[PDB]
Amino acid sequence: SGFRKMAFPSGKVEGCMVQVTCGTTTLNGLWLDDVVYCPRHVICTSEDMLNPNYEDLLIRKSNHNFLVQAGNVQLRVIGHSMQNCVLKLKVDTANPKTPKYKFVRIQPGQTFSVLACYNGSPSGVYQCAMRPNFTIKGSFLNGSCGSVGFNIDYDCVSFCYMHHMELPTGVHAGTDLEGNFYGPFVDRQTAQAAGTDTTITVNVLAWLYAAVINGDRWFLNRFTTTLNDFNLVAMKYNYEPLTQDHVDILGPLSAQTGIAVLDMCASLKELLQNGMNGRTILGSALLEDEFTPFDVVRQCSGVT
Amino acid sequence: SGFRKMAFPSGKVEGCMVQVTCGTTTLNGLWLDDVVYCPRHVICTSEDMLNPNYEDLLIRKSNHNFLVQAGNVQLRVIGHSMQNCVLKLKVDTANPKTPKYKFVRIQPGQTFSVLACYNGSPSGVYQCAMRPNFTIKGSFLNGSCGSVGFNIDYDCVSFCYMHHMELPTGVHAGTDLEGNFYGPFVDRQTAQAAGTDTTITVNVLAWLYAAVINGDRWFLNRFTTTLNDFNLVAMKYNYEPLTQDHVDILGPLSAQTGIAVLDMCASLKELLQNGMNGRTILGSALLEDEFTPFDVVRQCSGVT
Ligand SMILES: Cc1ccncc1NC(=O)C(F)(F)c1cccc(Cl)c1
């Protein structure tokens, strides 16, 4: 019992963190096998970030200009290449701590853990969701670029995010491990609009199931609704429209609790229309959308 | 920018987790140097937990009855001893992954990360606070006993908690690493009263400073208060009385933001008396008390 915003154990990722320095700039790199991945803006000076020509900036750099340090270990760089917004620094030594891993591009609404790092050293771990607008509401300061987001299934780390930048609004933007930004962002010091965000409906419903499993049941009511009716309410309250695909993924939670997905939708509809009336659900006074249905099943069963 | 309920990177602790089995019961153990620490109820059967005589139960056990497994590694047990509510199993091999560590007894109101484990395998990491009533509101299921709470300063892991039990109310109880329970709890399957809990005032104030540092300033007002006046409000709303010692530890945050501690107390007083009026602070619709002033300074500066 109890439900927490749980992050994956970060050990497998900590073993991969290195410091990357180029000229004046230092940030984090991810060392997997004989390659170190880091944001390509490591090659920029503060003045270059206004409108950087990365191809031209990288041409002035040689292998010996990229200083890669794994704490006390100095890595020898034998190749460098830019792939989208990431630099891939080939090193002469494969990381002995390389876990089984994959590079994945996550979907908006999915969750992942972040290992916030500074100067190649881990400082903390937290769980977050990729917002429907492709931003993350993380906790990052200068020097945190290169910190990565990941999920872990059995012994396999699926890397899904690399931190690149903080928008003028205080929200965060980054790329997949192929250097493709999530969302419309560009790695440049320019004001950039993040799209209109929405609340992740399927996740809120999953968290309402976790609340019932753990004893918070006050919000359950005698009503039901339809996908059509619920979606009119979701539209009014800036929630993602619920689809049959979302209902299908809530099947295990509906099956465990015996509460039909549309019956849970009617509880969510009433909470949207009436608020929480000064009460809490799983220690929260708002509707939480950072737990996917898989996260709920995992935490509620005890998956290691 | 951004503020998250950040846990310590769990790597150093993951390397210490083992599975301990005795008879029919399996739980988690912590392997530090040549000793494995685990809850003493590993020696009980379900029937023994009603009113266990641990001294008598441990007398029927020999070194070879304690099966300790570090994933694939089987440890040879050469000694066993009970210290308060923990068993210390001396093994013939020192854990090569033993980090620099200390055993500490934390104070109520302090925070720590928990590495939730099942069958000696880590499943997740989360940050929590030791409640003023010596319980923790964790996320633990059967098999999680032996999971530990910790803090990390530089390269040193200070172990402060070992999970033992879930109270009938769904809250959690455990011990320091010397096996002394936090609070009045006994390791027995009996209904046990947790004391009246309070909200950790100094932590709420610290989190209000973190909110100002990160841009959420709507709650700041033109008022001030005194320790006496604030404490009359804290008493009414079941908050811990604020002391000069608490004001002293808020000094760095008062110094960074230029907001006097008693001026922040007047904002907290108004939030207690009026509520949040449907607004949020750092993504929360309630007053958060799980961040200490040290946690705020650490996260806000980037301590690794
Ligand atoms: C200061 C900070 C705080 C949190 N997270 C990241 C950062 N850093 C940045 O945003 C940046 F200064 F490195 C930058 C500027 C423009 C474009 C890009 Cl790609 C990167």
Ligand SMILES: Cc1ccncc1NC(=O)C(F)(F)c1cccc(Cl)c1
């Ligand atoms: C079931 C569970 C869920 C979460 N956290 C822990 C547990 N387990 C327990 O409470 C227990 F059954 F092992 C137990 C019973 C009585 C006394 C003691 Cl010391 C331990």
